[PDB]
């Protein structure tokens, strides 16, 4: 639910290397 | 043809259709997987139904019945390779672990040959292709070289290129882009052969896109620029197209769609989307390497230019352009925040972009007109609005925008009956 929304960017990144940029700013 | 189960499977498709659990395809396969495992793995039978004639005396399959078989087929491929129930029905033993290996070999060796045939017969069907392209992920890509079956790899890449050039659906292009990334898995053997095939496909569309923009500077000239760019955008999402100069024509498409407003909404959405991936891809090379200070500045200039374009697009007349430009701003401000330097990456001080209060006001103002307002489309739009609010809520929690105005405003709009209640309660708590 909201956990998936607050963990992933608004525009979905298909490549994991790109998605790491948004995830490294979390936790 | 060969397999007798042709009657059993042709009626499993029927039992799935006529019972209307349309969104339980992966659930239906998991249900009858403990008892009917051997029937559901007869992919030879399934390919025969789709590819072979039904022989005189028998009645052919309908278009929908053929789409249901593919959907059921790919679920069987998933259940066999992954060896666990799908999402919704959440360790292996010794025999189960061995069977998983043989099942991967059987499904790979069968579909290395038959997948390009399936794609070829049903190339003009967007729904079917998007399902057929979900199979290579479960392949054991060593067999392409162990069995010396590179002859069939080219047939697959030839059919993938065929699907791309005659389809503009966003879901189909998504499946193609993800498949080419799997075939470039960098594992070992086939990494080289796929690259040449990938660069051929990109080159043939970078030209058909650049030369198509020069004609737009007409109703048919519009469709030429849109179709050629939408394909590049989906591929630029998953593949580093930085060696090509795609930002050049993407900026020019925006710098004259803002100055004049003559640009159509859909072309702006793709041009904005394409440029977002280019910047993100340029940032990955700067982050992983040991770059020079010039590199940070040329990327600093490129990011600053795009952020300005996104702010101007907030005042576009078309709502989709307004919607698209908002999500990219929330993502970039989060990627290019003070968290970007975290992790010993202090050599990224210039790339950090903090939003001024003038932009923070425009973002909050966008939430006021498109999130807080007064059956398949209202549930479609409800998720559309919840994604926008969650994107802004991220900026508040991580101290990227000032929270005191946004916090008070969210407390005043909590009259939306759980529409945003779970989202709002979470953002208010984290303060």
Name the residue in chain A with its Cα closest to that of B420: A2
Q: Is the Cβ of A4 closer than 8 Å to some Cβ of chain B?
A: no
When CB atoms are compared, the residue of B277, B283, B390 closest to A6 is B390
Contacts of A2 in chain B (CB under 8 A): 390, 422-423, 426
Q: For residue B49, count other CB atoms closer than 10 A to its CB.
A: 20
* Contact across the interface for A6 and B394, Cβ inside 8 Å: yes
Cα B278 to Cα B20, B31, B180, B197, distances in angstroms: 43, 44, 18, 21
Closest to B389 measured CA to CA, from B359, B408, B364, B412: B364
Closest to B25 measured CA to CA, from B83, B81, B70, B60: B70
A26 contact partners, CB below 8 Å, separation of at least 6: A7
Closest-CA distance, A8 to chain B, in angstroms, reads 9
B332 contact partners, CB below 8 Å, separation of at least 6: B276, B279, B303, B306, B307, B310, B353
d(CA B302, CA B293): 15
Q: Is B147 helix (H, G, I), strand (E, B) or coil?
A: coil
When CB atoms are compared, the residue of B237, B276, B343 closest to A24 is B343
Experimental method reported for this structure: X-ray
Is residue B124 a contact partner of residue B170, using CB atoms and an 8 Å limit?
no
DSSP B351: T
B319 contact partners, CB below 8 Å, separation of at least 6: B370
Tokens encoding B252: 């020019």
Q: Is the Cβ of A27 closer than 8 Å to some Cβ of chain B?
A: no
Closest to B178 measured CA to CA, from B203, B165, B160, B205: B160
Tokens encoding B263: 């640009």
> If you count them, how many residues does chain A have?
27
Q: Which residue numbers in chain A precede an interruption (C–N > 2.5 Å)?
A: none
Contacts of A13 in chain B (CB under 8 A): 237, 280
Sketch the domain layout of chain B as residue ranges: 240-354, 356-431
Is residue B106 a contact partner of residue B76, using CB atoms and an 8 Å limit?
no
Q: Is the Cβ of A15 closer than 8 Å to some Cβ of chain B?
A: yes
Long-range contacts of B165-171 (CB under 8 A, 24+ apart): B166/B123, B166/B124, B167/B126, B167/B129, B168/B226, B168/B227, B168/B230, B168/B231, B169/B126, B169/B130, B170/B230, B170/B234, B171/B126, B171/B130
d(CA B229, CA B145): 34
d(CA B78, CA B90): 14
* Contact across the interface for A21 and B283, Cβ inside 8 Å: yes
Closest-CA distance, A11 to chain B, in angstroms, reads 7
Closest to A9 measured CA to CA, from B398, B146, B245, B387: B387
B127 contact partners, CB below 8 Å, separation of at least 6: B67
Closest to B253 measured CA to CA, from B281, B282, B224, B220: B224
Tokens encoding B275: 């440029």
- φ, ψ dihedrals at B231, nearest 5°: -70, -45
d(CA B285, CA B308): 23
DSSP B316: -
Name the residue in chain B with its Cα closest to that of A15: B238
d(CA B231, CA B238): 12
* Contact across the interface for B281 and A18, Cβ inside 8 Å: yes
Q: Which residue numbers in chain B precede an interruption (C–N > 2.5 Å)?
A: 90, 217, 374
DSSP B356: P
Is residue B391 a contact partner of residue B367, using CB atoms and an 8 Å limit?
no
Taking the alpha carbons at both ends of chain A, their separation in whole angstroms is 17
The residue written with tokens 């040449």 in the block is B196
**Helical H segments across B289-398, by residue range:** 293-313, 319-335, 357-370, 376-397
Closest to B177 measured CA to CA, from B103, B238, B89, B261: B238
DSSP B354: P
Is residue B382 a contact partner of residue B318, using CB atoms and an 8 Å limit?
no
The residue written with tokens 């993407």 in the block is B250
Cα B354 to Cα A5, B142, B154, B304, distances in angstroms: 23, 47, 48, 11
Tokens encoding B64: 């929908």
> If you count them, how many residues does chain B have?
431
Contacts of B385 in chain A (CB under 8 A): none
Cβ-Cβ contacts under 8 Å between A and B: the total is 67
* Contact across the interface for A21 and B388, Cβ inside 8 Å: no
Tokens encoding B279: 């910047």
d(CA B136, CA B108): 8
d(CA B81, CA B250): 41
Cα B44 to Cα B3, B75, B159, distances in angstroms: 7, 15, 21
B171 contact partners, CB below 8 Å, separation of at least 6: B126, B130
Is residue B103 a contact partner of residue B81, using CB atoms and an 8 Å limit?
yes
Mutate to test the interface with A, among B277, B285, B333 (most CBs of A within 10 A): B277
Burial class (CB in 10 A: 0-12, 13-18, 19+), B61: middle
DSSP A22: H
d(CA B101, CA B217): 56
Name the residue in chain A with its Cα closest to that of B400: A25
Is residue B274 a contact partner of residue B268, using CB atoms and an 8 Å limit?
no
Cα A6 to Cα B327, B364, B374, B380, B392, distances in angstroms: 14, 18, 25, 20, 10
DSSP B89: -
């Amino acid at each position: 639910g909201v956990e998936k929304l607050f963990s992933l960017p608004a525009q979905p990144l298909w490549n994991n290397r790109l998605l790491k940029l948004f995830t490294r700013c979390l936790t | 043809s060969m397999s007798p189960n042709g009657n059993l499977i042709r009626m499993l498709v029927l039992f799935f259709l006529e019972s209307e659990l349309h969104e339980h395809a992966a659930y239906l396969v998991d249900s009858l997987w403990e008892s009917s495992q051997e029937l559901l793995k007869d992919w030879e039978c399934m390919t025969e139904l789709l590819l072979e004639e039904p022989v005189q005396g028998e009645e052919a399959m309908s278009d929908r019945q053929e789409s249901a078989l593919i959907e059921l087929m790919v679920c069987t491929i998933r259940q066999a390779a992954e060896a666990h129930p799908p999402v919704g029905r959440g360790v292996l033993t010794a025999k189960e672990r061995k069977t998983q290996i043989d099942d991967r070999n059987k499904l790979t060796e069968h579909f290395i040959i038959t997948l390009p045939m399936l794609l070829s017969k049903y190339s003009a069907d967007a729904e079917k292709v998007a399902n057929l392209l979900q199979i290579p992920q479960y392949f054991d890509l060593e067999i392409y070289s162990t069995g010396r079956m590179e002859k069939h790899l080219d047939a697959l890449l030839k059919q993938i290129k065929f699907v791309v050039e005659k389809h503009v659906e966003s879901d189909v292009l998504e499946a193609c882009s993800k498949t080419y990334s799997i075939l470039c898995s960098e594992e070992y053997t086939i990494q080289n052969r796929v690259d040449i095939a990938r660069s051929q496909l990109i080159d043939e569309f970078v030209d058909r896109f650049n030369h198509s923009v020069e004609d737009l500077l007409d109703d048919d000239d519009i469709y030429n620029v849109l179709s050629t760019l939408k394909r590049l955008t989906s591929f630029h999402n998953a593949h580093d197209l930085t060696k090509w100069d795609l930002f050049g024509n993407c900026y020019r498409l925006l710098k004259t769609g803002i100055e004049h407003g003559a640009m159509p909404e859909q072309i702006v959405v793709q041009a904005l989307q394409c440029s977002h991936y280019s910047i993100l891809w340029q940032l990955v090379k700067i982050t992983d390497g040991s770059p020079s200070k010039e590199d940070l500045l040329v990327l600093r200039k490129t990011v600053k230019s795009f952020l300005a374009v996104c702010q101007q697009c907030l005042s576009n007349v078309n709502t989709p352009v307004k919607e698209q430009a908002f999500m990219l701003l929330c993502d970039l401000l989060m990627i290019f925040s003070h968290q970007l330097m975290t992790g010993g990456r202090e050599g990224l001080q210039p790339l950090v972009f903090n939003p001024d209060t003038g932009l923070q006001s425009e973002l909050l103002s966008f939430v006021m007109d498109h999130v807080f307002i007064d059956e398949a489309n209202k549930i479609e739009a409800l998720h559309k609005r919840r994604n926008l609010l969650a994107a802004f809520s991220k900026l508040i929690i991580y101290d990227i925008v000032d929270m005191h105005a946004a916090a008070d405003i969210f407390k005043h709009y909590m009259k939306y009956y759980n529409d945003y209640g779970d989202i709002i309660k979470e953002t208010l708590s984290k303060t």
